[PDB]
Amino acid sequence: AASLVGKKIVFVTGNAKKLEEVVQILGDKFPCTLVAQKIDLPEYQGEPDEISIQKCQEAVRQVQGPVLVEDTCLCFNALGGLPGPYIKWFLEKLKPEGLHQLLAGFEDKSAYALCTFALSTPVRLFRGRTSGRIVAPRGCQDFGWDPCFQPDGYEQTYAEMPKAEKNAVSHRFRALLELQEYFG
């Protein structure tokens, strides 16, 4: 915790859009300095905690310096929290349009979006979560499942929202707030 002050932290992720968000959802005065190195890291099957812990332990082996990773899950309550940690693949095969069709046989259109950051130099996690409902796609297409996730309290999806608004209310925000709050 205190050890990482003013240090360099290699943030490892291939995803340009999430990195771009993570830079923006903080700034001066985040104590450390981040450095993006794109590496396509291989994730395990199971629970987001276990996955994130292991994903981080994998990054440690390859970078060896101080390191940070993250995982995002889109979890449908109708489907016991699935696709959850496998969302990436469902998005690859179905796209947002299809993700809505996936719940066509269920009344419960509700869901939640989970974001789990993992840190190393004993691994520590920082979790953020937003509840909502899965709808027919509305808005821009340039970032994953945003078009079909309508968060609770709002009449527009994450894709429709101006990035500024999303960055204030999102699952990522919730997690990043833990990360920042941990230092000071």
Place this chain on the structure above:
Amino acid sequence: SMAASLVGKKIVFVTGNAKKLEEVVQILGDKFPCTLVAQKIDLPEYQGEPDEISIQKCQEAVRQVQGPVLVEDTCLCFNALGGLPGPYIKWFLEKLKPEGLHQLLAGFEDKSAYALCTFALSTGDPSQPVRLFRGRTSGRIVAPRGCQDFGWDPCFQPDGYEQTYAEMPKAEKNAVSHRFRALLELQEYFGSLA
């Protein structure tokens, strides 16, 4: 090649799934030139393609057991969903049950599906390669029929048959299953020899 090295020897089928073991032992009769010893370890599986998952699972089994080793992974793949849930079928069965796995295709017209079963065999030496053996049955996902004995069987009706895996007597399932097709490749491999 490794066929020669493993013939007559002990191979450890490392799996946590007993029903799956029960079917392997009833498919391979007294007709197998090697001896199977089940050892229950529940192994972690990577995300990705079926082959690379199988390979890696084996290599993990190799680390924990040290002798010759056999592992396997089963997939249930819906064509409407581009081969999903596929290798992550466990977790969908676990949450949705067969009734739910049907409902999953409710808004999709295409009910066609296939089950893929991959076996992965290693000698024990981690440096030389893992040999793979697939089999795949085709069918469609239907409203659950039969009896909840084994996993997703009630909702899978194979092509050319009018009843589901669960409705079939276990003897008929073992004559036509994805796992039978894969163990055929394993028995093809051995029995190229004498």
